[PDB]
Enzyme design. Structure first.
Site, PDB file in Angstrom:
ATOM      1  N   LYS A 325       0.810  -1.204   0.000  1.00 29.12           N
ATOM      2  CA  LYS A 325       0.000   0.000   0.000  1.00 29.12           C
ATOM      3  C   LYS A 325       0.848   1.261   0.000  1.00 29.12           C
ATOM      4  CE  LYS A 325      -1.953  -1.880   3.562  1.00 29.12           C
ATOM      5  NZ  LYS A 325      -1.342  -3.238   3.452  1.00 29.12           N
ATOM      6  N   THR A 326       1.842   1.293   0.872  1.00 34.90           N
ATOM      7  CA  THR A 326       2.578   2.516   1.139  1.00 34.90           C
ATOM      8  C   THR A 326       3.538   2.869   0.012  1.00 34.90           C
ATOM      9  OG1 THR A 326       2.394   2.020   3.495  1.00 34.90           O
ATOM     10  CG2 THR A 326       4.212   3.465   2.832  1.00 34.90           C
ATOM     11  N   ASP A 379       0.256   7.852   5.813  1.00 35.97           N
ATOM     12  CA  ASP A 379       0.231   6.408   5.872  1.00 35.97           C
ATOM     13  C   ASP A 379      -0.149   5.904   7.248  1.00 35.97           C
ATOM     14  OD1 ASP A 379       2.469   7.051   7.351  1.00 35.97           O
ATOM     15  OD2 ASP A 379       3.849   5.823   6.211  1.00 35.97           O
ATOM     16  N   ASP A 380      -0.750   4.723   7.248  1.00 34.48           N
ATOM     17  CA  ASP A 380      -1.079   4.001   8.460  1.00 34.48           C
ATOM     18  C   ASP A 380      -1.870   4.888   9.412  1.00 34.48           C
ATOM     19  OD1 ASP A 380       0.159   1.678   7.538  1.00 34.48           O
ATOM     20  OD2 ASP A 380       2.109   2.293   8.325  1.00 34.48           O
ATOM     21  N   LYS A 407     -10.997  19.285   4.371  1.00 35.58           N
ATOM     22  CA  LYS A 407     -12.166  19.947   3.826  1.00 35.58           C
ATOM     23  C   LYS A 407     -11.893  21.376   3.414  1.00 35.58           C
ATOM     24  CE  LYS A 407     -16.161  18.897   5.654  1.00 35.58           C
ATOM     25  NZ  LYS A 407     -16.913  18.413   4.471  1.00 35.58           N
ATOM     26  N   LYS A 484       3.657  -8.423   0.726  1.00 36.49           N
ATOM     27  CA  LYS A 484       4.792  -8.112   1.585  1.00 36.49           C
ATOM     28  C   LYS A 484       5.194  -9.324   2.412  1.00 36.49           C
ATOM     29  CE  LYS A 484       5.501  -4.394   4.954  1.00 36.49           C
ATOM     30  NZ  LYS A 484       4.721  -3.266   5.451  1.00 36.49           N
TER      31      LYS A 484
HETATM   32  N1  LIG Z   1     -26.640  26.352  -4.550  1.00 36.70           N
HETATM   33  C1  LIG Z   1     -25.705  25.620  -3.924  1.00 36.70           C
HETATM   34  N2  LIG Z   1     -26.070  24.654  -3.073  1.00 36.70           N
HETATM   35  C2  LIG Z   1     -25.159  23.922  -2.424  1.00 36.70           C
HETATM   36  N3  LIG Z   1     -23.840  24.059  -2.596  1.00 36.70           N
HETATM   37  C3  LIG Z   1     -23.340  24.966  -3.446  1.00 36.70           C
HETATM   38  C4  LIG Z   1     -24.267  25.840  -4.142  1.00 36.70           C
HETATM   39  N4  LIG Z   1     -23.505  26.641  -4.882  1.00 36.70           N
HETATM   40  C5  LIG Z   1     -22.211  26.363  -4.637  1.00 36.70           C
HETATM   41  N5  LIG Z   1     -22.128  25.406  -3.717  1.00 36.70           N
HETATM   42  C6  LIG Z   1     -20.880  24.768  -3.295  1.00 36.70           C
HETATM   43  O1  LIG Z   1     -21.056  23.861  -2.228  1.00 36.70           O
HETATM   44  C7  LIG Z   1     -19.812  23.773  -1.557  1.00 36.70           C
HETATM   45  C8  LIG Z   1     -20.110  23.538  -0.092  1.00 36.70           C
HETATM   46  O2  LIG Z   1     -19.006  23.541   0.799  1.00 36.70           O
HETATM   47  P1  LIG Z   1     -19.332  23.669   2.368  1.00 36.70           P
HETATM   48  O3  LIG Z   1     -18.180  24.230   3.162  1.00 36.70           O
HETATM   49  O4  LIG Z   1     -20.781  24.039   2.578  1.00 36.70           O
HETATM   50  O5  LIG Z   1     -19.363  22.100   2.591  1.00 36.70           O
HETATM   51  P2  LIG Z   1     -20.538  21.476   3.455  1.00 36.70           P
HETATM   52  O6  LIG Z   1     -21.626  21.144   2.482  1.00 36.70           O
HETATM   53  O7  LIG Z   1     -20.788  22.361   4.647  1.00 36.70           O
HETATM   54  O8  LIG Z   1     -19.909  20.097   3.944  1.00 36.70           O
HETATM   55  P3  LIG Z   1     -20.682  19.429   5.166  1.00 36.70           P
HETATM   56  O9  LIG Z   1     -22.076  19.973   4.978  1.00 36.70           O
HETATM   57  O10 LIG Z   1     -20.548  17.954   4.887  1.00 36.70           O
HETATM   58  O11 LIG Z   1     -19.962  19.953   6.384  1.00 36.70           O
HETATM   59  C9  LIG Z   1     -19.020  25.049  -1.863  1.00 36.70           C
HETATM   60  O12 LIG Z   1     -17.686  24.798  -2.300  1.00 36.70           O
HETATM   61  C10 LIG Z   1     -19.807  25.772  -2.948  1.00 36.70           C
HETATM   62  O13 LIG Z   1     -18.995  26.091  -4.074  1.00 36.70           O
HETATM   63  N1  LIG Z   2       2.144  -2.827  -6.522  1.00 38.24           N
HETATM   64  C1  LIG Z   2       3.102  -3.640  -6.059  1.00 38.24           C
HETATM   65  N2  LIG Z   2       3.497  -4.720  -6.745  1.00 38.24           N
HETATM   66  C2  LIG Z   2       4.452  -5.524  -6.271  1.00 38.24           C
HETATM   67  N3  LIG Z   2       5.098  -5.317  -5.116  1.00 38.24           N
HETATM   68  C3  LIG Z   2       4.809  -4.250  -4.354  1.00 38.24           C
HETATM   69  C4  LIG Z   2       3.740  -3.357  -4.776  1.00 38.24           C
HETATM   70  N4  LIG Z   2       3.635  -2.400  -3.849  1.00 38.24           N
HETATM   71  C5  LIG Z   2       4.538  -2.691  -2.886  1.00 38.24           C
HETATM   72  N5  LIG Z   2       5.209  -3.801  -3.179  1.00 38.24           N
HETATM   73  C6  LIG Z   2       6.243  -4.406  -2.334  1.00 38.24           C
HETATM   74  O1  LIG Z   2       5.688  -4.463  -1.010  1.00 38.24           O
HETATM   75  C7  LIG Z   2       6.536  -3.859  -0.027  1.00 38.24           C
HETATM   76  C8  LIG Z   2       5.885  -2.726   0.778  1.00 38.24           C
HETATM   77  O2  LIG Z   2       4.572  -2.961   1.287  1.00 38.24           O
HETATM   78  P1  LIG Z   2       3.835  -1.744   2.059  1.00 38.24           P
HETATM   79  O3  LIG Z   2       4.889  -0.850   2.652  1.00 38.24           O
HETATM   80  O4  LIG Z   2       2.765  -1.083   1.247  1.00 38.24           O
HETATM   81  O5  LIG Z   2       3.120  -2.429   3.313  1.00 38.24           O
HETATM   82  P2  LIG Z   2       2.313  -1.525   4.361  1.00 38.24           P
HETATM   83  O6  LIG Z   2       1.731  -0.359   3.605  1.00 38.24           O
HETATM   84  O7  LIG Z   2       3.195  -1.302   5.556  1.00 38.24           O
HETATM   85  O8  LIG Z   2       1.123  -2.494   4.796  1.00 38.24           O
HETATM   86  P3  LIG Z   2       0.309  -1.989   6.072  1.00 38.24           P
HETATM   87  O9  LIG Z   2       0.075  -0.536   5.764  1.00 38.24           O
HETATM   88  O10 LIG Z   2      -0.911  -2.869   6.102  1.00 38.24           O
HETATM   89  O11 LIG Z   2       1.283  -2.234   7.195  1.00 38.24           O
HETATM   90  C9  LIG Z   2       7.744  -3.354  -0.795  1.00 38.24           C
HETATM   91  O12 LIG Z   2       8.880  -4.134  -0.461  1.00 38.24           O
HETATM   92  C10 LIG Z   2       7.480  -3.550  -2.266  1.00 38.24           C
HETATM   93  O13 LIG Z   2       8.579  -4.092  -2.995  1.00 38.24           O
END
Ligand SMILES: Nc1ncnc2c1ncn2[C@@H]1O[C@H](COP(=O)(O)OP(=O)(O)OP(=O)(O)O)[C@@H](O)[C@H]1O
Ligand SMILES: Nc1ncnc2c1ncn2[C@@H]1O[C@H](COP(=O)(O)OP(=O)(O)OP(=O)(O)O)[C@@H](O)[C@H]1O
Ligand SMILES: Nc1ncnc2c1ncn2[C@@H]1O[C@H](COP(=O)(O)OP(=O)(O)OP(=O)(O)O)[C@@H](O)[C@H]1O
Ligand SMILES: Nc1ncnc2c1ncn2[C@@H]1O[C@H](COP(=O)(O)OP(=O)(O)O)[C@@H](O)[C@H]1O
Lengths: 514, 177, 49, 15, 466, 59, 59, 59, 59
Positions: A325-326, A379-380, A407, A484
């Site tokens: 993953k990482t 990560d993690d 956000k 891994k």
């Molecule tokens: N008519 C509209 N109704 C709703 N959203 C709109 C409208 N026009 C624009 N927006 C967009 O909606 C986004 C809302 O971001 P806001 O900070 O409200 O998130 P939020 O909805 O409060 O998230 P949460 O409600 O999950 O906390 C803005 O970036 C804005 O550009």
């Molecule tokens: N897409 C891939 N294909 C093949 N080998 C990979 C790939 N991604 C990572 N590896 C191998 O896996 C190893 C690293 O794994 P990784 O660090 O993501 O584990 P991790 O993220 O620590 O898992 P967790 O977060 O659950 O502990 C590296 O040695 C790398 O060579």
């Protein structure tokens, strides 16, 4: 005032800033109140001395006065203030006595840090004359304004002095030289290598143009110091008993081998970023899903690169443990090759108060906000916010210092992204942060024997005979294994013998996959 | 005569130091005359105690160079009067700057040895416990070494248990490589 | 608080010593104790003779 | 008063 | 001769002057910087006496105090006592003013103003932008119980001194600088176009070219405003509910203005997540233009102790009181409370603070409309905070494709042709969507190839369950 | 041992004696101790009358 | 007030515990100084460090 | 403030616990003086140490 | 010792006032001491039952 002509190349740091101060500083006095003083900071200095010597080389047609440090100071009360009026009386006398307003007389006062405390409040209780700013301050601007001469300053650490004395009219101007950009550093070594490269002996196959970029964050003398060592190394080969004899040989060529050797060992930058601990073995394609993930990841990256309507892209990738993953996040990050990317990891926030653990995370996102765009990896997550299911307990502060920052929008006109990764999606649902994440990815574990054998081919650990031995029985488990661990247990079985792999390997593997 | 005497260990480190900072000393003069390369001003070496550094730091400069070493013990420079601190360092470099003025190309290579530098030199922006500017002898130092007047044909070596408390402003290359 | 600060501070030497020689002025005023008595000591007894 | 210290020396040597 | 500032001016003169016309020792006034302090000090002194000699004292009040600068600090007072002792038959008054305010001078100054010898019948007034720096003793009862037209004068002294800049831009753009430090770029105005490596190029016209702020930007102006960012995209009226909500909210902000017995009015508006209600509240707040507006946002105080967070809300909220009237907003209070569902846990002190705020009345006359944003109400129903609120507001998610198509029509994402394809089903699926997630999804759909834009759009709109 | 077993008078610091209000003179007292045995070694070489130092409550 | 336990307790290294070290170094130091008695008085004796109260410094 | 009632244990002796010792030692101390009168003023009669006001010191 | 006068102290500062008076009581031949209204002295609530354990342990 300026008697003679000059050539700019000498500093080679940047010509934008030299022109800028040249514009602002000298315009009043060559060809409104004139400029009486400057100061400037760079963190390692990185050529302060050359700059001051070189403009002093140019302008004065005389030697300006130099100060080493506090040396103004002396035990005798008032003689410390006699030392400054010593040099200021020349300029003052000339101005009113001579009256031509000839301002060739300028001084380099280095390390304002030492001589002045901001009001004297710094360092607590001090002698009344232990710090005298007031005398030389009153000297320059106090009795009447003086426009005939220029004072210069150097501080590697300006912040001590900055608040009190830099108010406008004493010095309103303040400048900083930053470390070189990639071409800046190119001309840095160019000038240093001018003298070498002007001689045919040195620097065949020099390849400076990749040397610069091989230096990410380096500055100044270390680049120069590479050359010091690079010669020293080529100078070493022939230095040979008590007497180490170098017979006369004018055959010596600084090769890239010298620079290459003296790249890593002798010199260390202030800031560096590496993927090594995060990447042991790279990634090897074990099938289509890896390419799928990179496909829609690069799709996502182009989205956030071109589009201004959604400055943030809230994404994560989840998978079961030990599934690569990482490293995968690191590689996609590199393929973006945005200018600023930081790896956040709890490893570096270890054993810290959770408040300290968020106050290390707010920092990096602000640093990334400063760029026009960036990609951050976290990560993690579960280990960052210390989830344990035994009874749920975690750090809540970390949660929200992670969450709301997802956000927000950095200042208008610059856009960014984040990415996160974890070993589980379920608590993330119940803990109500994945709703905040806009998109989700399932990174699978190895599900099937065929692609396993294919992965083994990439590793090439097993020869075809034993691969075929595997191929009969290996199919039918439909294994739940992450890679891994795969890498681990192959090595666990190799060490038994090269002859007997199987009794260890397969019987060890059956423990996995239920 | 060096004759590989007295150190008894760390041949690797000795080799690297020797080639690094005595190359300028050992070469025949013409070769660098084609270059623009100066002498290194100084070096620094540290490690755990009882590990053998003061032995070498004697032998280097005791035996290796034709000169008498100048030792400073750690705080010995320090005295209460504000200018006597700096006025004791310039005592150290006066010989080597005046013979520099006289004879530019070469000189008797007056060497200074700092020792246990961590007390005498630490970062300028820490006044805790001092409540004094007098931590800032360092400013005199690094404004003295390269300064406005660059000085070649001087060598200086630092010794510390604690490497991490020094202002790295005087650790940058050219002052300490 | 739970505060301990133990501190030191530094001196500014007084003036009036351009060179040590100044105390030779005392060696002068020794001498004009030295060169005064014999004048009268021979003066009054020179009046005696 | 180095003027007057030097004179406290010199004029009084003349005395 | 001071525009505005009449009630404070009105009260101050009577109390000090009535006694003159135990006598007060001094009166001290604290004002924000840029209040035209110098004119006021001159004006008050002039009013007090016909021709009482005006005395001006320089800014550096303190000195070492060991025999130098103590007598002079003593002497200026000392001069006043000389007349005072000489004339005992009738009241004699001398005015000394110290503008813009170590050990011994503190004690020394206090002793002179009040002594064993009374030393009364004289007054000294200090005016300062900051209270805390000045000595504690003055405060206790006893011893001391931009002006952009002015900036136009800064122009017509500094700028008039020397094809030009506009007459008025550099007087109304004060928010980032002030004229008292603005003396670098105007002097550079030569330097601006002069640096072309230029025996003389023909003489200049005083020419103004980017000499406006950018040559020496560092300055003090305390702008303290970042309103626009919360609404990055202007809100589009996509539906009757939008106009309903907006008009229903602004009838509140309107009825408050003429209200009595409701100086506070509490409303909570709530919708499901990723339905924009944060910009919406910012919009209605913009809609009713007030003297003062301020915004409590989790973004600023992230990672702070609870007692810092509440303190922050007080610190802004008492500024809002000190305004004559203003609305404020507090967003995302589930986060402000540090709420998590998995087990109930939250910050309690912030909760209780906020709840007591909602019914705390402003002191005599002033009024406010507080709004708050809520993803989920039921949590608040259990926390017994809702009764303190009033007239709460459900803002729905999109129910229908009509509203959807009209919304993206207002935006103009899709060409009508490709819009046909998604239009093919209006009812065929039914929607729970909020605007924010939708707007986030259209971008990735468009990023993909024109063949698959609507193809993937529909797939993902269905991925969230239509 | 210091004063009765062997021939010298040892210089002894009692606890802190050293510490002083001025910077550097506290530390200088250290070398005021060692500089009576230092020159002694300098001008008798290897063979020398023994010098001793007793610290106490050194922690 | 003068001497409380010096064992890196009562805050940071006690309250300037250098003092009690000097004192018990002084009275029992390398010279006997057999000719004095010190009176001491407390209302909270247990605080004092065992280093001082032992027999021969104060029995 | 200064005369808050100290309490006796190894830790948490206090921040200001050393001013009071000199005060009371001046009041009733060695080489008594009869030349004095001293007025305490407070709004907190219960926080004052009980020995500070015992008879003879403040009676 | 009643809670009436020891209002507001934190836990340890209650404990030390107890231990203070009892150590005053271990200095007299016969001592009758009172603890009134215990359940408030060690703060007790049925709801989500909570109290100060060290107070109890001390007692
Ligand atoms: N008519 C509209 N109704 C709703 N959203 C709109 C409208 N026009 C624009 N927006 C967009 O909606 C986004 C809302 O971001 P806001 O900070 O409200 O998130 P939020 O909805 O409060 O998230 P949460 O409600 O999950 O906390 C803005 O970036 C804005 O550009
Ligand atoms: N897409 C891939 N294909 C093949 N080998 C990979 C790939 N991604 C990572 N590896 C191998 O896996 C190893 C690293 O794994 P990784 O660090 O993501 O584990 P991790 O993220 O620590 O898992 P967790 O977060 O659950 O502990 C590296 O040695 C790398 O060579
Ligand atoms: N590597 C070595 N070779 C030979 N002798 C050594 C070596 N290391 C230590 N010694 C012994 O120790 C002495 C050197 O002391 P050392 O160099 O360890 O002091 P140091 O390391 O500078 O201590 P600190 O670093 O704490 O000042 C030598 O004179 C010898 O007696
Ligand atoms: N072209 C260059 N640009 C910047 N620095 C250089 C260049 N060439 C050499 N230097 C090195 O940089 C050093 C000057 O650094 P300086 O500004 O004095 O640092 P500090 O402020 O820490 O003393 C010189 O010693 C010199 O060797």
């Amino acid at each position: 005032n300026p008697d003679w002509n000059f050539e700019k190349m000498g500093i080679g740091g940047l010509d934008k800033e030299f022109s800028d101060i040249f514009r602002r500083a000298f315009a009043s006095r060559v060809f409104c109140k004139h400029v009486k003083g400057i100061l400037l900071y760079g963190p390692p200095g990185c050529g302060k001395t050359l700059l001051a010597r070189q403009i002093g080389k140019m302008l004065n047609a005389r030697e300006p006065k130099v100060v080493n440090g506090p040396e103004i100071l002396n035990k005798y009360v008032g003689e410390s203030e006699a030392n400054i009026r010593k040099l200021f009386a020349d300029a003052e006398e000339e101005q009113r006595r001579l009256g031509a307003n000839s301002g060739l007389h300028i001084i380099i006062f280095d390390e304002i840090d030492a001589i002045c405390k901001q009001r004297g409040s710094m360092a607590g209780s001090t002698g009344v004359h232990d710090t005298v700013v007031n005398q030389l301050l009153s000297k320059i601007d106090g009795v009447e304004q003086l426009n005939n001469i220029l004072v210069i300053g150097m501080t590697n650490r300006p912040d001590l002095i900055d608040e009190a004395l830099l108010r406008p009219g004493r010095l309103e101007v303040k400048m900083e030289i930053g470390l070189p950009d990639e071409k800046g550093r190119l001309q840095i070594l160019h000038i240093h290598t001018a003298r070498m490269r002007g001689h045919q002996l040195l620097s065949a196959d020099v390849d400076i143009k990749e040397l610069a970029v091989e230096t990410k964050n380096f500055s100044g003398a270390e680049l120069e110091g590479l050359v010091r060592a690079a010669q020293s190394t080529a100078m070493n080969r022939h230095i040979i008993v008590d007497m180490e004899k170098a017979e006369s040989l004018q055959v010596t060529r600084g090769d890239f081998l010298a620079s290459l050797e003296n790249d890593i060992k002798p010199a260390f930058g202030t800031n560096q970023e590496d993927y090594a601990s995060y990447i042991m073995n790279g990634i090897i394609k074990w099938g289509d899903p890896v390419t799928r993930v990179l496909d829609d990841g690069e799709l996502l990256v182009q989205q956030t690169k071109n589009s201004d309507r959604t400055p943030l892209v809230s994404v994560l990738l989840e998978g079961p443990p030990h599934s690569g993953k990482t490293a995968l996040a690191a590689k996609i990050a590199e393929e973006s090759n945005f200018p600023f990317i930081k790896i956040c990891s709890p490893d570096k926030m270890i054993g810290f108060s959770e408040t300290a653990k968020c106050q290390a995370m707010k920092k990096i996102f602000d640093d990334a906000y400063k760029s026009q765009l960036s990609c951050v990896v976290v990560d993690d997550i579960e280990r960052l916010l210390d989830y344990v299911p035994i009874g749920p307990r975690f750090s809540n502060l970390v949660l929200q210092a992670l969450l709301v920052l997802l956000k927000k929008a950095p200042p208008q006109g610059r856009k960014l992204l984040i990415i996160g990764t974890t070993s589980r999606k379920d608590v993330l649902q119940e803990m109500e942060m994945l709703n905040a994440f806009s998109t989700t990815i399932h990174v699978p574990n190895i599900a099937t024997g065929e692609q396993l054998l294919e992965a083994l081919e990439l590793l090439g650990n097993f020869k075809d005979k034993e691969r075929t031995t595997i191929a009969q029985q290996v199919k039918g488990k439909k294994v739940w294994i992450g890679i891994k661990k795969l890498l681990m247990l192959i090595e666990m079985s190799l060490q038994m013998d090269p002859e007997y792999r199987v009794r260890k390997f397969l019987a060890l593997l059956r423990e996995e996959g239920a | 005569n060096f004759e590989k005497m007295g150190i008894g260990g760390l041949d690797k480190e000795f080799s690297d130091i020797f080639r690094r900072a005595f190359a300028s000393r050992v070469f025949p003069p013409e070769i660098v005359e084609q270059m623009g390369c100066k002498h290194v001003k100084g070096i620094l070496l540290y490690g755990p105690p009882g590990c053998g550094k003061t032995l070498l730091a004697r032998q280097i400069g005791k035996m290796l160079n034709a000169r008498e070493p100048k030792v400073v013990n750690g705080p010995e420079i320090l005295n209460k009067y504000v200018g006597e601190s700096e006025a004791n360092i310039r005592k150290l470099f006066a010989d080597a700057e005046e013979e520099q003025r006289r004879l530019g190309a070469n000189s008797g290579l007056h060497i200074i040895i700092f020792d246990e530098i961590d007390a005498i030199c630490k970062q300028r922006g820490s006044m805790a416990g001092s409540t004094g500017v007098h931590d800032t002898v360092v400013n005199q130092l690094l404004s003295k070494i390269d300064g406005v007047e660059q000085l070649n044909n001087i060598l200086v070596i630092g010794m510390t248990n604690r490497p991490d408390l020094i202002d790295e402003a005087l650790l940058r290359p050219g002052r300490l490589e | 608080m739970a505060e301990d600060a133990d501190m030191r501070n530094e001196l500014e030497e007084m003036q009036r010593r351009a060179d040590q020689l100044a105390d030779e002025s005392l060696e002068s005023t020794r001498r004009m104790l030295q060169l005064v008595e014999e004048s009268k000591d021979a003066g009054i007894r020179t009046l005696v003779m | 008063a180095l003027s007057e210290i030097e004179t406290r020396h010199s004029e009084i040597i003349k005395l």
